[PDB]
Amino acid sequence: EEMRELMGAKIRVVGDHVVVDGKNLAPTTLARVRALQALYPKTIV
């Protein structure tokens, strides 16, 4: 939920770990996404 608000083109799903997906995202969006990587070790992009 914290990740979802901080970005609200991405798609956020729960699965079993946090999963983030998207087709054509700007470098800023990717940099922002991996900036949130310091909030949970179990993250994949």
Partner: protein, 50 residues
């Protein structure tokens, strides 16, 4: 999560430069120019005693 701007808008400076120069000159050449080195007198002697 904050990001910087692509660049910072600097201030623009106008420069006005002025270069001024004035030259004046005179040239004079007057009079009479005589010779200062001339030949002098000469003397010679010659004889056969024998």
């Amino acid at each position: 999560l904050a990001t910087p701007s692509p660049f910072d808008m600097e201030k623009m400076v106008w420069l006005d430069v002025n270069i001024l120069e004035i030259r004046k000159s005179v040239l004079e050449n007057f009079g009479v120019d005589w010779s200062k080195q001339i030949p002098g007198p000469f003397a010679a002697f010659g004889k056969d005693f024998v």
